[PDB]
Design a protein around this ligand. Structure first.
Ligand SMILES: O=[N+]([O-])c1ccc(O[C@H]2O[C@H](CS(=O)(=O)O)[C@@H](O)[C@H](O)[C@H]2O)cc1
Ligand SMILES: [Cl-]
Length: 661
């Protein structure tokens, strides 16, 4: 990167792209001090800053191979800037600073994407995005009654910016990416036309830059920096992972699903550990071993299923309930985070308390990986699991490494991902065992093989329904997570919001053109329609699983590309159609690899779908074989069973796509 003096200050560029511009009248950096409030209630945070100082660093001077910045001439410098390859390193010279703002040069028509897994807005331009892992919210839109009710009853509605997986990384339409190396609270402010502003509640070690001739090349570079995932295991291609939580009755319902012709790769029973009924619904018993009361012959059932070519998956998270038998084992070994007095810190998860396994203590992390992931899960015969949570570290607890919980909070999902990966690696099953996370932060990419979109409401809402999954996939894919999926039919049923047949079927239609089809009974299984309970829904589901299986050779080539190049399986239109600027904000269609275009129906009652077909070639409608020229809007019929999916006539996979007609 290139530092250049000007009349009154300096610029820093990557290539011909100016990134920072400083003068006394238009400073690049501001420094100061704040006292935050961050109140936690069941993984929801009410965050408010009290800024005591925000002071422009107007005065720059060269000092060896660095620049120092002070408030004004004749004042002691507060910040040092040092160029180091593709990074700007920052050193706090005034050790009182706990707030830093940095302005980066922006253009009027510029788009910015990333920010981790964003659930509402893909193109972040025009809005402000705090980056703090938490519950994403139920409803996530202060104008909906679901959100309002969630806020009033449990401070749980959230808003457009909340996510289980924030990351302080952006990709700019100017063909560079920026990454802030920090775990502190930070904010991306894209409200101004002429600059982007980053707020950090720390002076980060460095800010790193990635450039390239194409967006694809920059995503490759990012994925190499954060780490790539293994290829999907071959067993996944046998069909859907059926999610049931009905104890021994799960087996009979699976047989019913199978009798309809459904292609099944796995049975996922999150209640393998037992249930705990709460006011929220049928939650799980958070003690990570097979529960003989709920599944008295589970090991035998796993072997029966294996003989039928079906794997078995469970559930785990990084907390232990106080009333479970593992809790005193962990407490006795000193493996829990502590409170200010050195006692085990108890966290309320909603009508039950848990200890937090302290992964900053290497012995605790090793115990979790060896005893739970290794012995209780993999050695018990699980091929995979939901690896849940990560987003709830309160900021008033004490960690074994002595690092403030305010800094460890965002790091937690990555530490948790690493515990899972180490367990898997200790059994030689990297690339074969499949665990999936909803929570993330910088670095989760290297350890987690598959993301899921967390809890959507069981609806077609704009800010917590079906369509938000696509936003999540697109954003997280640019950040180097190649594989994304969602709960078919959503999760959260509260305040009378329950599934419909149509919702399930539309969600299944999308899921068949993603890496993994997986169902979930949700928080209130008997209040919500499940895939086995309606003949039409089940037959539609079976058919969609057959389509997914017929498409597996294509999906498998996309997984190979993901390993070779880092490119996500679900890509935004602009990644392959860079010279069509009007595509740059599209977030409800994706390219499934380079050769298929998918435009999910995300509203009730729709019989048709309108969308933009890009490029100058031909697109072939998957169900009819009708060809259409690229470069225009079209409207196609989308009855249930026939989502709006097209393939490139030029595709090397055309013979396969022709089969689906
Ligand atoms: O705050 N809550 O009450 C809360 C409840 C459920 C939550 O969902 C998470 O945890 C569920 C298990 S459990 O119900 O908390 O035991 C799983 O079935 C979901 O797939 C997962 O996303 C997450 C949070
Ligand atoms: Cl309710």
């Amino acid at each position: 990167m290139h530092f250049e003096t000007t009349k009154d200050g300096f610029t820093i560029a990557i290539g011909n792209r100016i990134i920072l511009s400083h003068s006394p009248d238009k400073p690049a950096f501001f420094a100061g001090f704040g006292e935050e409030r961050m109140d936690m209630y069941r993984g929801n945070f009410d965050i408010e800053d009290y800024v005591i100082e925000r002071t422009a660093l107007r005065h720059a001077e060269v000092s060896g191979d660095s620049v120092t910045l002070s408030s004004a001439p004749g004042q002691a410098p507060r910040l040092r800037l040092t160029l180091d390859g593709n990074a700007i390193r920052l050193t706090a010279l005034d050790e009182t600073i706990n707030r830093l703002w940095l302005r980066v040069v922006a253009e009027t028509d510029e788009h910015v994407w990333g920010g981790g897994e964003q659930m509402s807005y893909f193109d972040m331009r025009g809005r402000r995005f705090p980056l703090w892992t938490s519950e994403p919210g139920v409803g996530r839109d202060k104008t909906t009654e679901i959100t309002f009710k969630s806020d009033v009853s449990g401070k749980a509605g959230g808003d457009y910016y909340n996510t289980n997986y924030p990351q302080p990384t952006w990709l700019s339409s100017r063909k560079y990416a920026l990454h802030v190396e920090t775990s502190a609270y930070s904010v991306f402010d894209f409200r101004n036309g002429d600059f982007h502003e980053i707020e950090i509640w720390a002076v980060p070690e460095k800010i790193e830059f990635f450039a390239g001739d194409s967006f694809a090349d920059i995503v490759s570079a990012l994925s190499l920096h954060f780490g790539r995932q293994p290829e999907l295991p071959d067993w996944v291609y046998n069909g859907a992972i059926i999610g049931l939580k009905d104890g021994v009755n799960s087996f009979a319902r699976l047989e019913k699903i199978r009798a309809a012709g459904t292609k099944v790769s796995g049975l996922w029973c999150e209640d393998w550990v037992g249930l705990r009924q709460t006011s929220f619904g049928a939650r799980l018993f958070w003690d990570w071993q097979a529960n003989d009361t709920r599944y008295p012959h589970l090991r035998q059932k796993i072997a029966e299923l294996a003989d039928q070519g079906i794997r078995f998956l469970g559930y785990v998270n990084p907390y232990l309930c106080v009333d479970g038998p593992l809790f005193p084992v962990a407490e006795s070994a000193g493996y829990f985070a502590t409170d200010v007095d050195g006692k085990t810190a108890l966290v309320d998860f909603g009508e039950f308390d848990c200890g937090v396994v302290d992964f900053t203590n290497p012995a605790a992390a090793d115990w979790f990986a060896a005893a739970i992931i290794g012995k209780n899960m993999l050695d018990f015969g699980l091929s995979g699991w939901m690896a849940d949570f990560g987003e709830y570290l309160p900021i008033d607890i004490k960690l074994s490494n002595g690092v403030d919980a305010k800094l460890m909070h965002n790091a937690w999902p990555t530490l948790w991902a690493e515990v899972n990966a180490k367990g898997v690696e200790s059994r030689g099953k990297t690339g074969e065992a499949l665990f999936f996370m909803r929570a993330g932060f910088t670095g989760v990419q290297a350890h987690c093989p598959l993301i899921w979109g967390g809890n959507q409401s069981v609806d077609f809402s704009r800010h917590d329904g079906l369509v938000t999954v696509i936003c999540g996939a697109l954003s997280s894919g640019l950040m180097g997570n190649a594989y994304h999926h969602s709960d078919i039919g959503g999760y959260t049923s509260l305040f009378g919001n329950v599934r419909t047949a149509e919702l399930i079927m539309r969600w299944t239609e999308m899921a068949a053109f993603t890496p993994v089809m997986r169902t979930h009974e949700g928080n209130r299984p008997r209040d919500n329609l499940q895939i086995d309970q309606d003949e039409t829904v089940l037959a539609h589901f079976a058919r969609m699983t057959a389509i997914y299986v017929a498409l597996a050779p294509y999906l498998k080539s996309l997984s190979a590309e993901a390993a070779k190049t880092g490119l996500p399986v679900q890509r935004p239109l602009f990644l392959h159609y860079e010279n069509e600027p009007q595509t740059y904000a599209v977030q409800d269609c994706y390219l499934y690899g380079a050769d298929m275009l998918v435009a999910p129906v995300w509203k009730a009652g729709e019989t048709q779908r309108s969308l933009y077909l890009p490029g100058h070639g031909e697109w072939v409608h998957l169900w009819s074989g009708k060809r259409h020229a690229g470069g225009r809007d079209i409207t196609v019929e989308t009855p249930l069973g026939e989502p709006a999916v097209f393939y490139r006539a030029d595709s090397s996979h055309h013979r396969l796509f022709e089969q689906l007609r």
